[PDB]
């Protein structure tokens, strides 16, 4: 009978409706599929290169500013920090206390880029210190960025190999200790008391993080870093919550998730107890100063009125605040969900291979050293490698007794100098692209087959049943 026909048509209608609902719910689950493809002829951008000296403070600079009539704030601060008693003494002896309590005089204790960088060369063109930008850092105090995206437009690489990349001859400015003085190994820090250079190779125009993402370079070796470029392309809403925005910080930075988290930490500190930390990115918010500045410490020194008995305890509630919040943030990981930090939509990263070779050869030491002493200030009064130049000159101009002098000169030069080549190994860029797993066109195609037929069946059945 035709009732069987009607029931048997309506069951097919139900099946078609199930198909429609299933496909629509699949399209509303905005799945993504990633595919990796090698892009050639894509212009490669040379990364930003941040170099920091592992020894944050030059002791010889302190010694000769100690003899200077000028730089009185340094004498005041040192005598002040040794005359009293402070809770959290590990911070008072740190370099962050120097930075926070001596705003401008602290540049007289650090390393200047002219002292460090004795040779630069990019793409077979000579550098100077004129296209490095300096930033303050915690526990390194200064980090100099090449290709930071501020002085100049972004550099590009059109060749491979060490010749065409960046090449630096750096002197770590190691200093000879005085005969009777010795240092104290801070057994509560995992980074201090080394020599070398901390190098960060990061995406062009992004924020550096020398402590986390850097790698060390030892003196006396030519170290080469070969880079391979990678590009990650992500999808925005509704396929994901990635963003094209850029970080603000102290200067506009290209967006990276880690730097967003660091800025979130800084904002949380500022919100909670009205000061910012030196061990975190600077923000420059009004009415806010560093967590650890002791206001009027110069007045705290000088009892014009009867006050401040020696070995006193100076109350620093801001240090306790900042330390407590640091510990809470370091041991609890819940703030991350409360302050945004979406992933960047497009992100360039690098795969690096670092390798060492012995450098420089003895036969070429003297001439190299002749450059090093003929570039800087004509005041060669005293440097760690003056003895090296004297020994090498006395060898060249007029063999055991001179074997010791050659050995000592090489030992000094290789204790102080290093070379660093950063270059692109290949110009092919491996790109990981997100795609909509089930796009709108695919759904349109899958549905258009059943649309007309089944809503036609529905129209016919509805118009027949109405009578």
């Amino acid at each position: 009978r035709k009732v069987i026909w009607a029931l048997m048509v309506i069951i097919g209608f139900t099946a078609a409706t199930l198909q429609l609902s299933l496909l629509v719910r699949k399209y509303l689950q905005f799945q993504v599929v990633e595919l990796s493809e090698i892009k050639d002829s894509m212009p490669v951008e040379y990364p930003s290169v941040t170099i920091c000296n592992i020894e944050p403070i030059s002791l010889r600079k302190i010694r000769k500013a100690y003899n200077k009539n000028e730089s009185q704030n340094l004498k005041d601060w040192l005598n002040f920090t040794q005359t009293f008693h402070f809770k959290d003494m590990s911070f008072m002896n740190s370099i962050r206390a120097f930075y926070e309590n001596l705003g401008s005089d602290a540049k007289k204790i650090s390393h200047d880029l002219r002292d460090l960088l004795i040779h630069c060369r990019f793409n077979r063109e000579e550098c100077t210190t004129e296209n490095f930008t300096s930033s303050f850092d915690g526990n390194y105090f200064n980090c100099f960025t090449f290709n930071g995206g501020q002085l100049r437009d972004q550099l590009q690489m059109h060749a491979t190999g060490p010749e065409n990349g960046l090449s630096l001859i750096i002197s770590i400015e190691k200093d000879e200790p005085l005969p009777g003085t010795y240092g104290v190994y801070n057994f509560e820090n995992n980074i201090l008391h080394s020599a070398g250079v901390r190098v960060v190779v990061h995406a062009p125009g992004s924020m550096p993080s020398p402590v986390d993402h850097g790698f060390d370079i030892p003196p006396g070796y030519s170290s080469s870093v070969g880079l391979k470029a990678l590009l990650h392309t992500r999808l925005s809403e509704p396929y994901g919550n990635c963003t094209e925005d850029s970080l603000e910080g102290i200067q506009t930075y290209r967006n990276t998730f880690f730097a967003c988290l660091q800025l979130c930490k800084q904002r949380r500190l500022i919100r909670e107890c009205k000061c910012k930390s030196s061990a975190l990115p600077d923000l420059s918010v009004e009415n806010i100063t560093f967590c650890g500045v002791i206001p009027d410490w110069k007045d705290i020194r000088r009892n014009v009125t009867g006050e401040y008995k020696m070995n006193q305890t100076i109350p620093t509630i801001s240090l306790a605040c900042e330390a407590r919040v640091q510990k809470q943030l370091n041991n609890d990981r819940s703030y991350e969900t409360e302050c945004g930090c979406y992933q960047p939509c497009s992100e360039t990263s690098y795969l690096k291979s670092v390798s060492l070779s012995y450098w420089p050869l003895e036969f070429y030491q003297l001439s190299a050293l002749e450059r090093f002493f003929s570039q800087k200030n004509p005041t060669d009064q005293q440097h760690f490698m003056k003895i090296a130049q004297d020994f090498l000159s006395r060898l060249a101009h007029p063999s055991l007794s001179e074997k010791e002098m050659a050995k000592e000169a090489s030992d000094l030069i290789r204790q102080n100098l290093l070379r660093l080549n950063i270059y692109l190994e290949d110009l092919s860029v491996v790109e990981y692209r997100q795609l909509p797993a089930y796009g709108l066109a695919d759904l349109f195609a899958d549905i258009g087959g059943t649309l007309g037929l089944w809503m036609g069946i529905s129209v016919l059945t509805i118009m027949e049943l109405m009578e």
Copy 2:
């Protein structure tokens, strides 16, 4: 005519049946698609860190136990191995002979963790030797695991950078050779005669493999290892033969394919000729001893009855067995298909970046050394760095003639000490997840469109043809 209608309907029926068969056969090919996604707010687990000393045997320990009245088994074994002749002498001089033929006395020749580890620190909290677990190893003899998942639950990381990770100051216990003795370079081993530390960073609770997966760390440098966590999630049956089981071995281990293969090798040796090898994982199966134990070698020494002429050949069939099977397994790769070893369903791995810096600076050497000699046994009678402390103390308390002493002290200290920081570079975890390429829901959706309509057509045709 209507015969054309019937034929033209049945051809569409055949086409629909082809579509059904094609989609069903595609769904029965259980294909998988992998996608990589960055998981944030996922708790990162600090890896297991296994450290081994590259010099397996301390010669000074042998020398002073040689002078001891106690430790007579050592004299017996040494005099025994030099008085006779053995086939495969490369094993008799090895450390595996020491381990196998002196079950407990062999702990008196190796390096103790208290001698090696002079400073540990995790997450800014002090360690001791109390949370390292010792395991025997071939060709290193001892490997100490931190975060092995047995003493404590798995550790977790909530911060990045060297400060918050594991930091170790290690002394490789280098020993000064005697004036008249020299060693013999075993030109038939590619690993011996080095100094440093072999480090393995492996998934938490998995089985270490120092020879294969380790990396060396040289003395006199602070070496930092920055880690990035990766997670691989695989699918079980019917999409693949991955498993959630765990390896048994000597102790329950988290499953890894390489360790399963090593256990398979050990089981094959045990099955074939009833002994196990030291160069492979221990199994502890009853009635089974090491391939290379010479039973009653103490009795073989002592001819109570007239026997054992000097320069005799002691028959060791077990060594020949184990060597022959080792060579067959190393040159033939067919056993792998016969002993299971499915891949683990979930597996965490790490990308590591290792870098060196010069350490420690001279200005901070003395104080550091003051710790090293003030931690261990009050018996400072003789150590490789006693001269270093003497020279540095004579420099500090009361400048060429002292320049040589400073140079020598630094040379010793940097020949013996090293520092190792292992930390997480980022807390984001890149996860590679398998997905069913063509799931059940997708098949249901693709088929439901044609199901009702075409089996309705089939029912109508069948009921019409029956008359």
Copy 3:
């Protein structure tokens, strides 16, 4: 009415036609999906290993050939290059001038593999220099390839770890400078004046590129390179323009994109101004010689007729040509689109982890050195480490005054020797396979559902309308 029926059928026909067009256009967009799978039981091929000495020229060889009556071309060339004036003097002092202008005598200045390689061992079997193939290189002058795929078939690895891989003890042949001579640091090169070994680990039978893809190895350290194999499988047309061809060059090479680009550069130079460059792959095209050969420079030396006033300028238009085209190619990246260089269909790559340990230990130095001096020519007249052997022998046969000799011997030996182990960390191969995103079977299945039904509807409508 039935006109509504006809219109309502034809709209469904239009929808079905849209579905057909959409699916066909999707199938004509030959998309690909990549999936990564771990292949076990797949035979792993040991890579090709190219080693080059970083010091390209041994000065002692020049000195003693300078005293030889033979090798007169060297005296002629040296006296010629110092008597005149040349534009682009950085090339005349280079090693490429030596190579190009002294075709066969230049082998008397480089390093011979017998001088460098003092021990090889593969898969526990001894090597010789007999299965290394030598190739000329720019700025290294010689690169010796192991497992290059020419002398023998491709080697395979059936085991993991340092024991079963390749192990080399190499001497970098460092030479002691004369008391009164010193070198000139070429501050216009980023690679010169180092010591060590440049190692390239590349796909079996491919073309090496030591300057771009190599990594340095320092003397005095045992450096271990652990490799993990990766295989990339790409799709040919119509899914992509990958190829299965092989590069020609000077010898048949397995295809790699970078080597194709280098050969393209060489062909472009040859086309543009009829000479080839030494800093690029050799091609051996007829009527073509190196860009930088000065024809009849021996005749240019000797004015039989009154000519060639001293400090003359010798016109070398070929050098200017080759330099100008090099600069254009290095700063412009448009040639890449004009000379093919499709990606290879199948390509094996490696992930490498390099690590150092101190080597050799002092206790084992003498015996090691006893091998080194007892392998080479019985003429031990003068070598950089003769003093080391003398000191060690005088220590062993008959303790401060001997502490200096031990220290000096160790300093020499560790300045000259190094060890290199290259091995496979795991035998699992991670393969990235391309797949057709929407294959022919998938399209056939998606279309067969609608084919019969809707072209049946079309046939019925067409045959009804014709009357």
